[PDB]
């Protein structure tokens, strides 16, 4: 890999610079290089990895949605035939998105998850696995769509099981996992009731544990609680 000659510490330093410059593709490439050094990632380093790829795939998803909407409109009654270009370009963006997802899943499988023994790291990585299978599911239309959905579900479920055993209900990783798994239920699994139940129960159990927290931990937990409430407001 092109980052094989760069020191681990230099890759991490450069990922931080890339973030400051809003160069998320570079950030992701640096962090991929850092992961491929083979050492486990610290919390801060896991955050850099996640932020980089979230931003890259987030932009690809937004572009894919724009293109998919144009494509759908082209297939409506009375829409003039404009040739294969819209489908081709949506496919191009889709293929690039799938590539990024496969890259992230590959880092998780080789070998981040297997080396992650602490609850905070293992839950974080399993959440990411669920997230990137979810992005694959968003664009899946073929023989494997069910298996992709199930891969997302399974990763999220293992993360949920660990989180509930090992982390307090206010822990931001537990909260963020539940937020995203709830979205999975609503948007991917056609299970809005499960989505709403998960968001509500997670919010309420967190509320009950806030009293244990410092001011700074309270701030972290309540920010994600508000995202849960925002989704509940959207869905009810």
């Amino acid at each position: 890999g092109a980052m094989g000659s760069m020191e681990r510490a230099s890759l991490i330093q450069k990922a931080k610079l890339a973030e400051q410059a809003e160069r998320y593709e570079d950030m992701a490439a640096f962090m991929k290089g850092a992961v491929e050094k083979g050492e486990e990632l610290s919390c801060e380093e896991r955050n850099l990895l996640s932020v980089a790829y979230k931003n890259v795939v987030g932009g690809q998803r937004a572009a894919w949605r724009v293109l998919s909407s144009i494509e759908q409109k082209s297939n409506e009654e009375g829409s003039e035939e404009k040739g294969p270009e819209v489908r081709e370009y949506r496919e191009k963006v889709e293929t690039e998105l799938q590539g990024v997802c496969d890259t992230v899943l590959g880092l998780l499988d080789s070998h981040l998850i297997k080396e992650a023994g602490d609850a905070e790291s293992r839950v974080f990585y399993l959440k990411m696995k669920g997230d990137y299978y979810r992005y694959l599911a968003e664009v899946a239309t073929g023989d494997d769509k069910k298996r992709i959905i199930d891969s997302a579900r399974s990763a999220y479920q293992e993360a949920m099981d660990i989180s509930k055993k090992e982390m307090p209900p206010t822990n931001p990783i537990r909260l963020g996992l539940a937020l995203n798994f709830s979205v999975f239920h609503y948007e991917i699994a056609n299970s809005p009731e499960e989505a709403i139940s998960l968001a509500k129960t997670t919010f309420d159990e967190a509320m009950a544990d806030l009293h244990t927290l410092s001011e700074d931990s309270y701030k972290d937990s309540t920010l994600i609680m508000q995202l849960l409430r925002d989704n509940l407001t959207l869905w009810t």
Binding site: G176, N180, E187, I224
Partner: peptide, 5 residues
């Protein structure tokens, strides 16, 4: 679109 982190 709903919130995720």
């Amino acid at each position: 679109f709903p919130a995720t982190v």
